[PDB]
DNA sequence: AACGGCGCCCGAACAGGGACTG
DNA sequence: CAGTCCCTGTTCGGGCGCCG
């Protein structure tokens, strides 16, 4: 009893064509039963070969979560639509959320299943179960109503959801909601009891009208920035003050104030690294006036909303994981340092893949975006480990580079 | 009025703005005129070819060759036309089946759909798009021109179609029986079970008569009922598998695509029989662009080439996957970035073997390779068994520790043991953290010009020592690299070194132990032979230590 | 002399970043 | 500041094996 709204490409681009990878038996079994219960509830339909489309599906298990949740990595047809979920029908970020003490995440893409489809638009939504020791050909669905992991399924669903949220919104006006792909962004100034009491009172909301039992929760407040820190030490070698210039000459990339005329002063000569070199006078001076432009923040750094977002880490070692979110070069948004996550001096890709999915959540609260991520891993690497770690229903952009540490920026 | 199969058809369109098939037909010997007018009588009378005529403006030739080495003859179109305006199809084809991934089974049965692509229909709206006429005679009858009502074999729609039809069929029969086994592979089927001999030809019968009233025949002549079967070219037996016989060709002077030929059986012989090599063979293959080009064999290849010809003399074969036992892949270092594995469960039964000898990046070491070499088996063995394999590594735990920790990338292995077979793969040389007190420092820098390609190189230490080396045809890596070459050169076995390449402290401090450059293979045995080097870099042009003097020296 | 699938080893074409020259 | 170079990387299409 609903119209379809309806849905078209960007001008001049198909849709997407991306193969299937290869899948772990209990990731097959479990997207053969997924799919067996939505094609009885009539969500999903099987297609044939003169479908040219396809994209790839897995399944993931979220954080203390044993019940496997189909995921499907609609990055290409996200960005052949990006027309629709962000110029015709847009969601607007507040800015408040970030500001909250206590920000609950909501898996409420199940609701997306209630609205049917675009008729013309279903076949951009084919995908392609494998098979084990390819023993049957690839068995092909397609989407019949609003797919999670699509952005223009909380697009067409924003009227709808506005409307559900309507009397909560009106019974507790302090409380920010925002919507991200399959995600409800809850955030409060409450108290964690009065928070996740008025959580569950959405919850009931929702009810009224397979993952709505977890309350992932946020703490924005407590989030923290990684400034460039120089050392201190009480004796300075060649090989030290060698060390700190080359740091403070790629730190005058951002603050354009830092000089290393006095400390260069100290490498006069042809000098062993071990040598002592005693500071000047003008030495400590030079250095303590660097050392304020590092607490001085940086000149005209601002968020763009018509920019992307790229992030960028750094592997330091010993479980320490380093980052910068800027849109242009040295015109960093944040910075911060991550230790001590799961995996942790066992399992770099686990780590690496803890490290995006939280970065990719700062930047969803903080700007509504996700970045897309440089990663200091080789391609087959990443690709052969990652969806084994992977937590998250939505998935960001990335590329792979290989930057030697020649000097150490971020974390001494 | 043809009748309609029971098999339901699949709506295929073409692209927008393009009409269909009008290419002339092709002058052929009078032994295919004799052999495709008898076709077009029978798959008329069969309703699998219809009569048209001027009301369809299109034209397609036909050439045909003989059949997979039998009496009967194959019938092929040339679609290449027809297949440039017809709209893509998803292939639904996502590998092959590996007969190392299939289970135990009682009974095994292997099935041969015949007429395969002539059982299935065409769309209704595109059967006017083939058209093709029939020359009776190679230049007096016209010919009468038909159409096709079924799947043409040459079209590029032809495979997908039939196996996304295939297994329609089958499903119902499948939800039936569930546990029996069924192999699907274009039209061969590969049925399995656990049940009496008895009562598994009852099913058969079963499943014959299934895909029977969809007009799918199963004859007598491709119907294999004991072992040893012939299924994606191996060898099936009731406890073991192995390939069918691999002959490979021995000339007396081998040319470019004799040895395309020579290389490729090996990679499928290195299925199954391990420490097969191409690494010498394929290197022939490098430069020469004639296919019909002498090319005589190297020592080194011929060396090769003998050690794989007496590894293929004793017969090896695989065994089946069992799912109550863990899989274990061991890895072999080969020599010369040469890999060899193999895939078991039980000691010495091998599911199957593979190599891994793939160079990427210009430096590296047999760490890096280790770590690759993984990733494939792993992937592979998703592939065919859906899980990862526990894996026995020639690389001391110790050893993999300080090279994942170290490193600058995120880099891991799955859950893994320490295997002593040498040679064992270990790191050649360790760049110290800090500066080393004591040894020489050696402020290095080479320069070069862009125009003439001559350059210098040399350093400065803090003991007085110097050197400038002038270059000829060099540039300002090069230079930089033998800058740092020259210190190791002239140091004692503890050396700290400084330079503003970072160029060449990138290269140097990922621990390579094979380049495609000499000068970088050289610097290697240098590092080797030290006992302790600390590499520094600092920015050029900023007035910093030695670095200043150097630089003064080589421009 | 056809179609589709997968694998390997190959070279040409292309992208991208440091560094020097006008 | 552009426009090159040098070096190293990925992508892709074709050679071959094999299957239907
Ligand atoms: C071997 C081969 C096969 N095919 C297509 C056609 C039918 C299926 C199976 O081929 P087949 O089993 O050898 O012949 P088929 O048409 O089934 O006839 P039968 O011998 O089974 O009676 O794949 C093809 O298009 N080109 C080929 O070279
Ligand atoms: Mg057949
Ligand atoms: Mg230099």
Not at chain 1, 194 to 202: A, N, S
Not at chain 2, 332 to 359: C, D, H, S, V
Not at chain 2, 473 to 497: P, R, W
Request: glycine share 6%.
């Amino acid at each position: 009893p609903i119209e379809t709204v309806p849905v078209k490409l960007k001008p001049g681009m198909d849709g997407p064509k991306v193969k299937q990878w290869p899948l772990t038996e209990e990731k097959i079994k479990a997207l053969v039963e997924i799919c067996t219960e939505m094609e009885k509830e009539g969500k999903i339909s099987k297609i044939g070969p003169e479908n040219p489309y396809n994209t790839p599906v897995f399944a993931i298990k979220k954080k203390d979560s044993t019940k496997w949740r189909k995921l499907v990595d609609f990055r290409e047809l996200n960005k052949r639509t990006q027309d629709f979920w962000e110029v015709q029908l847009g969601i607007p970020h507040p800015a408040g959320l970030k500001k909250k003490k206590s920000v609950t995440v909501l898996d409420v893409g199940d609701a997306y299943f209630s609205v049917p489809l675009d008729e013309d638009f279903r076949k951009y939504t084919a995908f392609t179960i494998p098979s084990i020791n390819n023993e049957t050909p690839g068995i092909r669905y397609q989407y019949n109503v609003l797919p999670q992991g699509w952005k223009g399924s909380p697009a067409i669903f924003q009227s709808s959801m506005t409307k559900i949220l309507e009397p909560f919104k009106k019974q507790n006006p302090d409380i920010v909601i925002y919507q991200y792909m399959d995600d409800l962004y809850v955030g409060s100034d409450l108290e964690i009891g009065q928070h996740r009491t008025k959580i569950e009172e959405l919850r009931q909301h929702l009810l009224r009208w397979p993952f709505l039992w977890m309350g992932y929760e946020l703490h924005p407040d407590k989030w923290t920035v990684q400034p460039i820190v120089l050392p201190e030490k009480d004796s300075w070698t060649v090989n030290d003050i060698q060390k700190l210039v080359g740091k403070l000459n790629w730190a005058s990339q951002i603050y354009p104030g830092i000089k290393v005329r006095q400390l260069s002063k100290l490498l006069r000569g042809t000098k062993a690294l071990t040598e002592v070199i005693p500071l000047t006078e003008e030495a400590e001076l030079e250095l303590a006036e660097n050392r304020e432009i590092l607490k001085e923040p940086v000149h005209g750094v601002y968020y763009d909303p018509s920019k992307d977002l790229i992030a960028e880490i750094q592997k330091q070692g010993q479980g320490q994981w380093t980052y910068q979110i800027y849109q242009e070069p040295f015109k960093n948004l944040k910075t911060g340092k991550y230790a001590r996550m799961r995996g942790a001096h066992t399992n770099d890709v686990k780590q690496l893949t803890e490290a995006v999915q939280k970065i990719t959540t700062e930047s969803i609260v903080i700007w509504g975006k996700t970045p897309k991520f440089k990663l200091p891993i080789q391609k087959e690497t990443w690709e052969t480990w990652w969806t084994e770690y992977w937590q998250a229903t939505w998935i960001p952009e990335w590329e792979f580079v290989n930057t030697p540490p020649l000097v150490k920026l971020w974390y001494q | 009025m043809v009748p309609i199969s029971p098999i339901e058809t699949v709506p295929v369109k073409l692209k927008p703005g393009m009409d269909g098939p009008k290419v002339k037909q092709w002058p052929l010997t009078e032994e295919k005129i004799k052999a495709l007018v008898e076709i077009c009588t029978e798959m008329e009378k069969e309703g699998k070819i219809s009569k048209i005529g001027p009301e369809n403006p299109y034209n397609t030739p036909v050439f045909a060759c003989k059949k997979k080495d039998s009496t009967k003859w194959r019938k092929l179109v040339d679609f290449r036309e027809l297949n440039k305006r017809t709209q893509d199809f998803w292939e639904v084809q996502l590998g092959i089946p590996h007969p190392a991934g299939l289970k135990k089974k009682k009974s095994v049965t292997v099935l041969d759909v015949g007429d395969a692509y002539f059982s299935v229909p065409l769309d209704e709206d595109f059967r006017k798009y083939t058209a093709f006429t029939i020359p009776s005679i190679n230049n007096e009858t016209p010919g009468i021109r038909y159409q096709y009502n079924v799947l043409p074999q040459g079209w590029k729609g032809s495979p997908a179609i039939f196996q996304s039809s295939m297994t329609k069929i089958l499903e119902p029969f499948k939800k039936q029986n569930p546990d029996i086994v069924i192999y699907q592979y274009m039209d061969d089927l590969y049925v399995g079970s656990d049940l009496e001999i008895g009562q598994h030809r009852t099913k058969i019968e079963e499943l014959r008569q299934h895909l029977l009233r969809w007009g799918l025949t199963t004859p007598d002549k491709k119907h294999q009922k004991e072992p040893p079967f012939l299924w994606m070219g191996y060898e099936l037996h009731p406890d073991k598998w192995t390939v069918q016989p691999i002959v490979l060709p021995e000339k007396d002077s081998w040319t470019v695509n004799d040895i395309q030929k020579l290389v490729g059986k090996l990679n499928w012989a290195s299925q199954i029989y391990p420490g097969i090599k191409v690494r010498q063979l394929s290197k022939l293959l490098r430069g020469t662009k004639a296919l019909t080009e002498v090319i005589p064999l190297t020592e080194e290849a011929e060396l090769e080439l003998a050690e794989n010809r007496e590894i293929l003399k004793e017969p090896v074969h695989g065994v089946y996957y069992d799912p109550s036992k863990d899989l274990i892949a061991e890895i072999q270092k080969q020599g010369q970035g040469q890999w060899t594995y193999q895939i078991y469960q039980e000691p010495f039964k091998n599911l199957k073997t593979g190599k891994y000898a793939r160079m990427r990046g210009a430096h590296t070491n047999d760490v890096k390779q280790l770590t690759e070499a993984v990733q494939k088996i792993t992937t592979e063995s998703i592939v065919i068994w859906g899980k990862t394999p526990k894996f026995k590594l020639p690389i001391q735990k110790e050893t993999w520790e300080t090279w994942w920790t170290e490193y600058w990338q995120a880099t891991w292995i799955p859950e893994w043991e320490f295997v002593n077979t040498p040679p064992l793969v270990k790191l050649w040389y360790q760049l110290e953290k800090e500066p080393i007190v004591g040894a020489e420092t050696f402020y290095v820098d080479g320069a070069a010009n862009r125009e003439t390609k001559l350059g210098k190189a040399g350093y400065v230490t803090n003991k007085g020592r110097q050197k400038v080396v002038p270059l000829t045809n060099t540039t300002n890596q090069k230079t930089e690299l033998q800058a740092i070459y020259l210190a190791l050169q002239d140091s004692g076995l503890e050396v700290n070194i400084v330079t503003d390449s970072q160029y060449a402290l990138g290269i140097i401090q990922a621990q390579p132990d094979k380049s495609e450059s000499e000068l970088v293979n050289q610097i290697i045995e240098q590092l080797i032979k030290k006992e302790k080097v600390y590499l520094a870099w600092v920015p050029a042009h900023k007035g910093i230590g030695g670095n200043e003097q150097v630089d003064k020296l080589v421009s």
